[PDB]
């Protein structure tokens, strides 16, 4: 008997596109920025203190962004549309108002709105003038209803912050060395530090390397430096099997060659190795508790939780040299996508700290010197620093932050307006990390981990084939979570603490670690109970539904990830060979008694991450479900992207032809939008008589390509004619060309500025 199919299961996709995916990724990141992260940066820098003349301070109370404005010549302001900002070649910005509390002799002096700078507002975000409006009210603003939004406007050009792809920080990566060695490393990044530690086996003895230390030091010296001195506890934390000890032997035999037996002696040994930026012991103790493996916390200089972590690193090196199961940089569970919010956070943080430092410098110069009368800092808020910083970093494309050592170039691109699909396609690119170093042919290939997260067909052809990729139709990038209740749920579920044991329990066959974004929460027996109970607490809504949990049965670690920037994707839950979505549910969706979030909370749809779908068994169609299924694919045509959605019958072609079509579909002359006659752009191609396609995909109906199309239905004979059509050439018709086929208008621009000089003389 055939399993009965839910035939209207397709509707879960247009209901999904109302909320998430299809440039709403950028908008939900920028809303997160201007609603929590600017307050968090203000909380991290809430009080400045001048060095000379203390007990005088500036205290920021709260910060705001508000609606966009414009500054004019006669000190008059008026709210603005985006289209006026496109025409007049200005930047569509809103002023940052912050309320301060400070001292002028009188100890409590307050203000409620002190404007310090202008944030560029991304279109259709929470502060933009466009959102929530009806298609009758976009006419009075001269803005297209189908213009996707998510691009800034700075100095009249439309700029898009591209989705940057990174390697996931704070995670143990076992890689091969150039000369045949196998070493591990973790780029330990928190908000206050980024540094890469290592682990090298260059003689059969485990050396640790770091940018701080002048020379690599052996690992057992470091274990003795971190408050565990007995060699038995070290080898217990490493492992109790025979060949682990046999591989670790010459590292023990090194530490008995020198006289390192006491923690003070080991810290003295390290204190000679430190590059000097109490000199011996404190510069090694603060180095261990602040810079080597900095993503692991030290409470009261209790180094136990860092000893366990570096023992896990050395155990993975030893078990990796036995059988070469190294990890790869290309698995997309280990990637994280950095959206527009997580670059504007860094930019605003660096600019705000330079603002506070410049203000503290001016305050330190002017207080002890000029006059006994207490000045105010309100006369010293030069807004040009914040405004020029934000605008130059968006409009130029380089993010040189010396605080964070980030020197990325070419983040922003001018939004290409050749057609509608060009705009909608550049709003979903993912620029890769390497950015054309050399032809490595490792990350350029299509890995199978990109199933349903990224587009298999759409990639550029040329020098960048495979680096620039495009998001799929039905994906979602997570934001940062609160990190709170995951720990409290994990502690109640039988996770014993790591401090209540020696390392011998780490090498048992029944004991799995748990991690949380790279930090050990403890150990656990019966991991299946933990994973299933945690998933049933996720589906009921007590945990935020993007928290994924997976199990690595080889390395014996149960990951629980909660950081933001990783790719999730909805599925239909299958419980004992039946789908959880019944026809009554899709009928209630088609009538309007429920929406997609109510599918999330009734345990019908859940978001798998890439790491979590490593363990799930996904069935594509209903007739593939067997006894070991957990999730059902919602719609399999959402495997392909947006630009591959133009193709009719793409599963009949040879796959290079789909990539050539994904390149050529961004260049098709069409119609930009309904505002295309009020719009002065640099180079705009229109088609005189566009037509909607005769064989259309469902993607065309979703992204509304049939409302403003690009191309004309042509009566095509397929025959050989007159030999002028040899290598891909095609013969047209003269009468069709005369009656209007392929007629196209080309609009160009010519601008002239008439500036007033510093002298009172003007161009004329």
Partner 1 sequence: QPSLHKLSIMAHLARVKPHRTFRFNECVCTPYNADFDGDEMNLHLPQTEEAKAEALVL
Partner 2 sequence: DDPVVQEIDVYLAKSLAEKLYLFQYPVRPASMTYDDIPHLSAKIKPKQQKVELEMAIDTLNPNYCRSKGEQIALNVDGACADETSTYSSKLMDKQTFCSSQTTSNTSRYAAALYRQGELHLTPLHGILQLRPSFSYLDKADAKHREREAEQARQRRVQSYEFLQKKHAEEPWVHLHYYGLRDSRSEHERQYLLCPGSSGVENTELVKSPSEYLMMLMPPS
Partner 3 sequence: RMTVGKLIELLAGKAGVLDGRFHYGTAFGGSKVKDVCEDLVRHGYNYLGKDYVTSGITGEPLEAYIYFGPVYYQKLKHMVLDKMHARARGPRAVLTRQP
Cα 278 from Cα 281, distance rounded (Å):
7
Residue 310 CB, nearest approach to partner 2 (Å): 17
Q: Which string of x and - marks every residue 203-242 that binds partner 2 (by CB under 8 A)?
A: ------------------------xxxx-xx--x------
Q: Which does 542 bind (CB under 5 to 8 A by kind): partner 2, partner 3, partner 1, none?
A: partner 2
Q: Does 272 bind partner 2 (CB under 8 A)?
A: no
Q: Is 738 annotated as a binding residue?
A: no
User: What are the CA-CA distances from residue 118 to residues 93, 105, 160 (Å)?
Assistant: 6, 31, 18
Chain centroid to Cα 467, Å, comes to 16
Residue 485 CB, nearest approach to partner 2 (Å): 7
Residue 595 or 653 with smaller CB distance to partner 3 = 653
User: What are the CA-CA distances from residue 179 to residues 183, 202, 203, 749 (Å)?
Assistant: 11, 9, 12, 58
Closest to 565 measured CA to CA, from 125, 29, 17: 29
Residue 121 or 486 with smaller CB distance to partner 2 = 486
Q: Is 43 annotated as a binding residue?
A: no
Q: Which string of x and - marks every residue 714-743 that binds partner 1 (by CB under 8 A)?
A: ---------x--xxxx--------------
Q: Does 262 bind partner 2 (CB under 8 A)?
A: yes
Strands (E), 148-246: 152-154, 157-161, 163-167, 173-176, 182-189, 194-199, 207-208, 217-218
Q: Does 687 bind partner 3 (CB under 8 A)?
A: yes
Strand 93-104 with 106-110, pairing: antiparallel
Interface with partner 2 in residues 512-571 (CB under 8 A) = 542
Cα 98 from Cα 419, distance rounded (Å):
41
Q: Does 508 bind partner 2 (CB under 8 A)?
A: no
Q: Does 745 bind partner 2 (CB under 8 A)?
A: no
Q: Is 577 annotated as a binding residue?
A: no
Q: At what angle do helices 384-396 and 341-366 cross, to 10 degrees?
A: 150
Q: Which does 232 bind (CB under 5 to 8 A by kind): partner 1, partner 3, partner 2, none?
A: partner 2
Residue 81 or 422 with smaller CB distance to partner 3 = 422
Residue 471 CB, nearest approach to partner 3 (Å): 16
Q: H/E element holding 731?
A: none
Cα 420 from Cα 425, distance rounded (Å):
8
**Strand, coil or helix: 187:** strand
Tokens of 139: 């006419």
Cα 200 from Cα 208, distance rounded (Å):
6
Q: Which does 723 bind (CB under 5 to 8 A by kind): partner 2, partner 3, partner 1, none?
A: partner 1
Interface with partner 3 in residues 614-653 (CB under 8 A) = 636-637, 639-640, 644-645, 647-653
Residue 656 CB, nearest approach to partner 3 (Å): 8
Furthest-apart CA atoms within the chain: distance in Å: 96
Residue 724 CB, nearest approach to partner 1 (Å): 9
Q: Which string of x and - marks every residue 657-676 that binds partner 3 (by CB under 8 A)?
A: x------xx-xxxx------
One of 71, 272, 301, 714 touching partner 2 (CB under 8 A): 301
Residue 192 or 738 with smaller CB distance to partner 3 = 738
Residue 170 or 236 with smaller CB distance to partner 2 = 236
Q: Which range in 75-83, 307-315, 318-326, 486-494 contacts partner 2 by CB under 8 A?
A: 486-494
Contact 612, 551 (CB under 8 A): no
One of 408, 594, 698, 707 touching partner 3 (CB under 8 A): 698
Q: Is 196 annotated as a binding residue?
A: yes
Closest to 708 measured CA to CA, from 669, 658, 742, 660: 669
Residue 482 or 727 with smaller CB distance to partner 1 = 727
Q: H/E element holding 101?
A: strand 93-104
DSSP 644: G
Q: Is 667 annotated as a binding residue?
A: yes
Q: Which range in 444-452, 469-477, 495-503, 749-757 contacts partner 2 by CB under 8 A?
A: 495-503
229-240 burial, b if ≥16 CB within 10 A, otherwise e? beeebbbbbbbe
Residue 597 CB, nearest approach to partner 2 (Å): 17
Q: Which string of x and - marks every residue 413-442 that binds partner 3 (by CB under 8 A)?
A: -----x------------------------
Residue 727 CB, nearest approach to partner 1 (Å): 5
Cα 520 from Cα 497, distance rounded (Å):
9
Q: Does 696 bind partner 3 (CB under 8 A)?
A: yes
Nearest 5°: CA angle at 54, between 52 and 59?
Answer: 115
Q: Does 220 bind partner 3 (CB under 8 A)?
A: no
Q: Does 716 bind partner 3 (CB under 8 A)?
A: yes
Q: Does 499 bind partner 2 (CB under 8 A)?
A: yes
Residue 489 CB, nearest approach to partner 2 (Å): 7
Residue 146 or 311 with smaller CB distance to partner 2 = 311
DSSP 315: H
Q: Which does 729 bind (CB under 5 to 8 A by kind): partner 1, partner 3, partner 2, none?
A: partner 1
End-to-end CA distance of the chain: 86
Residue 434 or 660 with smaller CB distance to partner 1 = 660
Strands of 335-338's sheet, edge to edge? 335-338, 163-167, 429-431, 469-470
Q: Does 693 bind partner 3 (CB under 8 A)?
A: yes
Residue 176 or 502 with smaller CB distance to partner 2 = 502
Tell me the Cα Rg of the chain.
30
Contact 98, 359 (CB under 8 A): no
User: What are the CA-CA distances from residue 750 to residues 432, 439, 524, 753 (Å)?
Assistant: 36, 41, 70, 10
Cα 754 from Cα 258, distance rounded (Å):
78
Q: Which range in 492-500, 518-526, 653-661, 670-678 contacts partner 2 by CB under 8 A?
A: 492-500
> How crowded is residue 465: how many other Cβ atoms within 10 Å of its Cβ?
12
Total number of residues that touch partner 3 (CB under 8 A): 44
Compute, in degrees rounded to 10, the torsion defined by CA atoms 734, 739, 740, 741: -40
Q: H/E element holding 760?
A: none
Residue 376 or 497 with smaller CB distance to partner 2 = 497
Contact 173, 341 (CB under 8 A): no
Residue 411 or 668 with smaller CB distance to partner 3 = 668
Residue 76 or 735 with smaller CB distance to partner 3 = 735
**Strand, coil or helix: 398:** strand
Cα 592 from Cα 253, distance rounded (Å):
72
Instruction: Report residue 716: phi and psi, to 5°.
Output: -105, 120
Residue 285 CB, nearest approach to partner 2 (Å): 6
Closest to 214 measured CA to CA, from 262, 283, 264: 283
DSSP string across 544-600: -TT-EEEEETTTTEEEEE--SS-EEEEEEEBSSSSBS--HHHHHHHHHTS--HHHHH
Contact 83, 140 (CB under 8 A): no
One of 35, 265, 533, 667 touching partner 2 (CB under 8 A): 265
Q: Does 125 bind partner 2 (CB under 8 A)?
A: no
Q: Does 715 bind partner 3 (CB under 8 A)?
A: yes
Contact 458, 641 (CB under 8 A): yes
Q: Give contact residues for partner 1 (rule: CB under 8 A).
A: 723, 726-729
Instruction: Summarize the annotated binding site for RNA as residue ranges.
Output: 169, 196, 413, 667
Q: Give contact residues for partner 2 (rule: CB under 8 A).
A: 49, 51-54, 227-230, 232-233, 236, 261-265, 282, 285-286, 299-302, 304, 482, 484-485, 488-489, 492, 497, 499-500, 502, 542
Instruction: Summarize the annotated binding site for Mg(2+) as residue ranges.
Output: 728
Q: Give contact residues for partner 3 (rule: CB under 8 A).
A: 418, 636-637, 639-640, 644-645, 647-654, 657, 664-665, 667-670, 685, 687, 691, 693-699, 710-719, 742, 744
């Amino acid at each position: 008997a055939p399993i009965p199919t839910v035939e209207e299961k397709w509707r879960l996709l247009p209901a999904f596109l109302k909320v998430k995916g299809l440039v709403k990724q950028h908008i939900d990141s920028f809303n997160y920025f201007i609603n929590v992260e600017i307050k968090k940066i203000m909380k991290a820098n809430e009080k400045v203190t001048s060095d000379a003349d203390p007990m005088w301070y500036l205290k920021y109370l709260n910060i705001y962004v508000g609606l966009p404005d414009v500054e004019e010549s006669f000190n008059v302001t008026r709210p603005v549309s985006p289209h006026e900002c496109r025409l007049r070649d200005m930047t569509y910005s809103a002023p940052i108002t912050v309320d301060i509390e400070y001292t002028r002799g009188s100890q409590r002096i307050i203000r409620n709105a002190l404007p310090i700078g202008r944030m560029p507002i991304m279109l259709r975000s929470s502060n933009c003038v466009l959102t929530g409006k009806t298609p009758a009210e976009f006419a009075k603003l001269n803005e297209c209803p189908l213009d996707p939004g998510g691009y800034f406007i700075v100095k009249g050009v439309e700029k898009v912050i591209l989705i940057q792809e990174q390697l996931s920080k704070n995670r143990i990566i076992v890689e091969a060395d150039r000369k045949g060695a196998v070493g591990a490393s973790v780029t330990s990044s928190t908000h206050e530090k980024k540094s890469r530690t290592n682990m090298a086996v260059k003689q059969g003895r485990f050396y640790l390397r770091h940018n701080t230390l002048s020379e690599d030091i052996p690992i057992v010296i470091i274990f003795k430096a971190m408050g565990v001195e007995s060699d038995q506890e070290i080898v217990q934390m490493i492992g109790t099997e025979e060949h682990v000890m046999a591989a670790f032997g010459p590292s023990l035999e090194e530490c008995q060659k020198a006289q390192i037996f006491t923690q003070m002696q080991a810290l003295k040994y390290i204190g000679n190795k430190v590059r000097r930026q109490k000199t011996k012991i404190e510069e090694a103790r603060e180095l261990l508790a602040s810079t080597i493996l900095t993503h692991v916390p030290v409470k009261e200089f209790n180094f136990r939780a860092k000893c366990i972590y570096t023992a896990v690193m050395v155990r993975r090196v030893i078990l990796a040299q036995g059988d070469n199961k190294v990890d790869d940089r290309d698995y997309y569970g280990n990637k994280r996508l950095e959206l527009a919010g997580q670059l504007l956070s860094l930019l605003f943080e660096d600019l705000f700290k330079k603002f506070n430092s410049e203000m503290k410098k001016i305050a330190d110069q002017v207080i002890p010197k000029q006059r006994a009368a207490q000045f105010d800092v309100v006369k010293h808020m030069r807004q040009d620093q914040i405004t020029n910083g934000m605008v130059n970093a968006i409009s130029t494309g380089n993010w040189s932050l010396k605080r964070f050592k980030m020197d990325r170039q070419g983040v922003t691109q001018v939004l290409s307006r050749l057609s509608y699909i060009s705009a909608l396609g550049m709003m979903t690119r993912i620029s890769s990390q390497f950015e054309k170093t050399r032809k490595v042919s490792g990350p350029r290939s299509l890995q199978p981990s990109q199933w349903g997260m990224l587009c298999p067909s759409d990639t550029p052809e040329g020098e960048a084939c495979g680096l620039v990729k495009n998001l799929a139709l039905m994906t979602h990038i997570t934001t940062d979570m609160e990190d709170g209740p995951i720990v409290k749920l994990a502690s109640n579920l039988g996770v014993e603490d790591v401090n209540l044991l020696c390392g011998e329990e780490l090498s048992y066959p029944n004991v799995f670690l748990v991690f949380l974004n790279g930090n050990i929460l403890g150990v656990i027996r019966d991991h299946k109970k933990l994973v299933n109970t945690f998933r049933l607490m996720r589906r009921a809504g007590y945990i935020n539904e993007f928290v994924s949990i997976s199990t690595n049965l080889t390395d014996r670690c149960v990951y629980i990830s909660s950081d933001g920037g990783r790719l999730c994707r909805p599925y239909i839950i299958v419980k004992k060979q039946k789908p959880a979505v019944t026809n009554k549910h899709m009928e209630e969706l088609a009538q309007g008694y429920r929406n997609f979030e109510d599918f999330l909370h009734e345990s019908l749809v859940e978001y798998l991450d890439v790491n979590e779908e490593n363990d799930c068994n996904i069935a594509l169609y209903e007739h593939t479900i067997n006894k070991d299924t957990t999730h059902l694919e919602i719609e399999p045509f959402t495997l392909l992207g947006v630009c591959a959605g133009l193709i009719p019958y793409p599963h009949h072609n040879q796959s290079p032809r789909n990539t050539y079509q994904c390149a050529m579909g961004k260049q098709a002359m069409g119609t930009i939008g309904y505002n295309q006659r009020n719009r002065i752009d640099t180079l705009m191609y229109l088609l005189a008589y566009p037509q909607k396609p005769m064989v259309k995909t469902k993607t065309i109906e979703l992204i509304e390509f049939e409302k403003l199309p690009a191309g004309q239905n042509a009566t095509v004979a397929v025959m050989s004619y007159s030999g002028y059509d040899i290598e891909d050439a095609l013969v047209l018709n003269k009468a069709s060309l005369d009656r209007g086929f392929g007629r196209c208008l080309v609009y160009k621009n010519a601008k002239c500025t008439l500036k007033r000089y510093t002298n009172q003389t003007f161009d004329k």
